[PDB]
């Protein structure tokens, strides 16, 4: 199971506590010795301590370092906002899984960008709505097929067999 140090949940726990105590009122930058210290989990083992400091707080995609201390700051980088034509023309992963984990807020609420995004190639699909927001773009519905619902509704046989032959017999 890859690499494990001491007790599982130290990361998903250190970040959460740090978040929690900061929300609670203790609002100042910390250190890895400092969370350990304040929870007296200091005896996590130097190896784990080190692995947590160098890697756990490096593999975190949203952790904020000015230098010594680690902060929240979900916005860790400057979002590219618009002009994602590179991701739109990246036709190697079907749009590369567009998600709202950094979209919205920035310098703009998605909608304003989207309308232009709607105006442009950019395509927005809130099928899961608030839970999942995604962007993929190209070949919009070519035709509608009047009564496509009815043609799909008429054919609801599924498993039944002996139908392919009845096709040719009706065309003969």
């Amino acid at each position: 199971s890859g690499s494990s140090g001491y007790k599982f949940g130290v990361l998903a726990k250190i970040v959460n506590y740090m978040k929690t105590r900061h929300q609670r009122g203790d609002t100042h930058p910390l250190t890895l010795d400092e969370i350990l210290d304040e929870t007296q989990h200091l005896d996590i083992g130097l190896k784990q301590k080190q692995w947590l400091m160098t890697e756990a707080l490096v593999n975190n995609p949203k952790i904020e370092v000015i230098d010594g201390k680690y902060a929240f700051k979900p916005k860790y980088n400057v979002r590219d906002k618009k002009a994602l034509l590179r991701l739109l023309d990246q036709h190697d992963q079907r749009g590369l899984g567009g998600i709202l984990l950094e979209d919205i807020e920035e310098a703009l609420p998605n909608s304003q960008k989207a309308v232009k995004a709607l105006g442009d190639q950019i395509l927005f699909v809130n099928r899961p709505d608030k839970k999942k927001i995604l962007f993929f773009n190209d070949k919009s519905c070519q035709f509608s097929v009047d009564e496509e619902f009815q043609k799909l509704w008429r054919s609801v046989t599924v498993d039944s067999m002996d139908e392919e032959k009845i096709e040719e017999y009706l065309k003969r």
Binding site: R94, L152, E163
Partner: protein, 179 residues
């Protein structure tokens, strides 16, 4: 199946909505498509992805490439069948039907034949009067879609053929190239 993939491009643009179409786009590459990979890549809901997959399974698409890990396939042999049954239903209605021409008095909701109100037909008013009450009848008891549906059903899939011509030709080429 190069001209079949080109057809796949035309059917997913003429039939399905985007939720289906995005999944169908992945089906483009018939090399290897894991359930875990397709879930993570699409970021669709697992229950919902299972619904779409189950729907595609209903189309006969996937050939359960079980390891368990599954690779998805495409088996739409009903394409040349749906058309036969759709065209049947189009022609059935477009053709003709008997017209129930009869009179009906809106006040007493009594029912009359064209014959019933003919004896009633009142020559002083040039129209048809109900029996026990002189309130005027209804012009037609029932109307059967026939010649108006005739026009829009002669412009049904026949008018969605030109935008289907791209795929009609490319599939005829699949059906012909692969012999």
């Amino acid at each position: 199946p190069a001209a079949l993939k080109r057809l796949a491009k035309y059917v997913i643009r003429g039939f399905y909505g985007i939720e289906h179409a995005l999944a169908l786009d992945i089906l483009i590459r018939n090399s290897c498509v894991k359930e875990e990979d397709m879930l993570e890549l699409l970021k669709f809901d697992r229950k919902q992805l299972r619904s779409v997959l189950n729907n595609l399974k209903g189309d006969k698409f996937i050939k359960c490439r079980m390891r368990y890990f599954i690779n998805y396939r495409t088996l739409v042999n009903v394409v040349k069948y749906k058309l036969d049954h759709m065209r049947r239903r189009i022609e059935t209605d477009e053709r003709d039907s008997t017209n129930r021409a009869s009179f009906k008095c809106p006040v007493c909701s009594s029912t009359f034949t064209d014959l019933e109100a003919n004896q009633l037909f009142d020559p002083m008013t040039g129209t048809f009067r109900c029996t026990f009450c002189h309130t005027e009848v209804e012009e037609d008891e029932s109307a059967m879609p026939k010649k108006d549906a005739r026009t829009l059903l002669a412009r049904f899939n026949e008018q969605i053929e030109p935008i289907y011509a791209l795929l009609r030709e490319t599939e005829d080429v699949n059906l012909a190239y692969e012999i």
